């Protein structure tokens, strides 16, 4: 009954109203606007909530779902790489979860720079990429891991662990089991890195805007929001947070597209049902 078709229809009803309400108008005061002709949004209709924006020149948002703090963003445009690396470094990023497939990255028509699998130089920043483990997530889905070492003259050098799932197709939902395994790996990777900073006495431990996992796919609304939803359900602090809560929270803090496809919502619903977590707010 609480996960039956009636509840699911009501959940979709409430979220569909929120999605349409949050659709961006022209020059919408709720959304970050391109500065002076330079492309900001990878997709014209997938925009960045202004009040939770991380940087004025990125399509990227601070997201807090219940207690779980993350950053969701689009795949950075080529012009945005320097700012993107600065965001990663200032955030002391404990894990960067990239869900864009290798074929997407390879397709030059899509303009998705290969910024974490190769070393490169972007403005004042030089990035060293090293390969580390590879972790199977199930159903043949593979997480390839890396460290990005971000260097800049006069700046503290920051190394960012990277979890790249290279065979999760766009506009699809991998199974609840694969999502659960990926969420565990991302959470685990961030906890190892966060612990390091804590053992070092980093001042970023006391900063709510820092030490946030950064998650992106291509647009930062589909596979990205599925993972963020799964991660928030692994947080023991989020007892009783509903699926309506978590999707509504992602949408108000980024855009109305968060959790783009019904199959992505269905993964979140199945994970909630496994935990006895409510779909609907009373």
């Amino acid at each position: 009954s609480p996960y039956g078709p009636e509840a699911r229809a009501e959940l979709s009803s409430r979220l569909t109203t929120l999605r349409n309400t949050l659709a961006p108008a022209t020059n919408d005061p709720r959304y970050l606007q391109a500065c002076g002709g330079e492309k900001l949004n990878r997709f014209r209709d997938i925009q960045c909530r202004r009040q939770t924006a991380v940087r004025a020149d990125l399509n990227a948002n601070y997201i807090q779902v219940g207690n779980t703090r993350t950053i969701a963003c689009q795949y950075p445009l080529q012009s945005q790489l320097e700012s993107h690396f600065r965001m990663l470094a200032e955030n002391r990023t404990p894990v960067l979860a990239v869900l864009a497939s290798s074929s997407e990255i390879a397709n030059q028509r899509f303009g998705m720079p290969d910024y974490f699998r190769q070393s490169g130089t972007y403005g004042s920043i030089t990035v060293e990429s090293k390969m580390t483990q590879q972790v199977g997530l199930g159903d043949g889905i593979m997480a390839d891991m890396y460290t990005l070492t971000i260097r800049e003259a006069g700046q503290k050098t920051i190394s960012v662990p990277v979890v790249h799932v290279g065979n999760w197709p766009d506009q699809t939902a991998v199974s609840s089991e694969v999502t659960k395994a990926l969420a565990s790996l991302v959470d685990q990777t961030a906890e190892t890195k966060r612990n390091m900073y804590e053992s070092k006495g980093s001042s970023a431990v006391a900063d709510d805007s820092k030490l946030r996992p950064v998650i992106h796919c291509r647009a930062g609304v589909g596979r990205t929001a599925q993972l963020i939803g799964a991660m928030c359900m692994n947080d023991s602090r989020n007892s009783q947070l509903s699926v309506e809560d978590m999707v509504s929270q992602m949408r108000v803090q980024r855009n109305g597209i968060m959790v783009q496809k019904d199959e992505q919502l269905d993964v979140l619903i199945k994970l909630a049902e496994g935990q006895g977590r409510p779909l609907l707010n009373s």
Side-chain angles (χ1 to χ4, degrees), residues 210-241:
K210 300 185 188 294
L211 294 180
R212 287 172 183 248
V214 177
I215 305 97
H216 72 79
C217 36
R218 193 177 162 184
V221 292
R223 316 158 240 151
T224 294
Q226 180 173 328
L227 177 58
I228 289 172
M231 294 168 62
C232 117
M233 298 196 228
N234 284 337
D235 194 338
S236 56
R237 296 169 299 167
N238 293 334
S239 312
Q240 292 300 319
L241 186 79

Side-chain angles (χ1 to χ4, degrees), residues 14-30:
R14 300 176 182 186
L15 295 173
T16 299
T17 293
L18 187 62
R19 171 164 186 181
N20 306 334
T21 293
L22 293 173
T26 282
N27 196 30
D28 198 316
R30 304 172 299 178

Side-chain angles (χ1 to χ4, degrees), residues 26-276:
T26 282
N27 196 30
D28 198 316
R30 304 172 299 178
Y31 288 107
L32 201 63
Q33 299 295 315
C35 197
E38 181 112 87
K39 190 181 202 174
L40 176 61
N41 307 313
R42 181 174 286 283
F43 301 99
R44 288 179 290 255
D45 61 304
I46 302 177
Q47 305 191 7
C48 176
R49 187 80 186 216
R50 184 180 291 173
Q51 54 193 344
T52 59
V54 183
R55 294 176 71 81
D57 60 352
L58 296 181
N59 181 306
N61 294 96
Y62 294 114
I63 294 193
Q64 182 174 328
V65 178
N67 290 278
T68 305
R69 295 160 184 92
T70 62
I71 291 166
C73 58
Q74 73 186 17
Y75 204 115
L77 295 164
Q78 168 67 27
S79 77
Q80 296 170 334
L81 284 174
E82 180 173 9
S83 192
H84 185 80
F85 282 116
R86 185 60 91 98
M87 162 177 85
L88 288 180
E90 294 178 352
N91 172 61
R92 268 54 173 154
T93 300
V95 65
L96 164 68
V98 176
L99 314 176
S101 68
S102 296
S103 45
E104 287 172 277
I105 302 174
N107 188 337
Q108 296 311 281
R109 296 173 163 187
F110 295 165
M112 295 160 65
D114 199 16
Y115 76 89
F116 56 93
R117 287 187 311 183
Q118 301 144 355
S119 299
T121 295
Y122 318 90
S124 302
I125 298 175
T126 63
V127 175
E128 167 183 13
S129 170
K130 313 182 193 180
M131 300 182 54
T132 57
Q133 326 97 280
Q134 301 181 240
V135 180
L137 301 171
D139 296 331
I141 310 303
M142 205 79 23
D144 297 311
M145 294 182 65
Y146 304 85
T147 66
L148 295 187
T149 298
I150 307 177
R151 292 184 175 93
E152 181 177 8
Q155 299 295 311
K156 181 184 177 192
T157 297
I158 299 299
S159 294
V160 183
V162 185
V163 178
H164 177 213
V165 182
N167 59 338
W168 181 346
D170 191 8
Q171 302 295 319
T172 68
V174 297
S175 71
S176 67
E177 296 79 11
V178 171
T179 307
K180 187 190 298 294
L182 174 56
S184 294
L185 176 62
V186 176
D187 285 338
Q188 172 69 67
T189 300
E191 192 45 51
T192 300
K193 185 69 181 188
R194 223 181 266 106
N195 175 74
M196 183 282 303
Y197 284 119
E198 189 182 357
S199 68
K200 296 279 195 187
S202 156
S203 52
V205 307
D207 197 328
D208 191 281
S209 60
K210 300 185 188 294
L211 294 180
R212 287 172 183 248
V214 177
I215 305 97
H216 72 79
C217 36
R218 193 177 162 184
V221 292
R223 316 158 240 151
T224 294
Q226 180 173 328
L227 177 58
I228 289 172
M231 294 168 62
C232 117
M233 298 196 228
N234 284 337
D235 194 338
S236 56
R237 296 169 299 167
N238 293 334
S239 312
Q240 292 300 319
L241 186 79
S242 63
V243 180
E244 171 179 6
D245 279 331
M246 63 184 70
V247 179
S248 169
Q249 282 169 12
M250 290 189 273
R251 286 182 176 191
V252 175
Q253 297 174 62
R254 174 136 170 85
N255 59 57
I257 314 299
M258 293 297 280
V259 190
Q260 185 174 32
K261 305 221 71 158
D262 299 354
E263 312 97 277
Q264 298 162 345
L265 185 61
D266 289 349
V267 167
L268 298 181
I269 286 170
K270 185 181 177 188
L271 295 175
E273 180 162 26
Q275 298 180 329

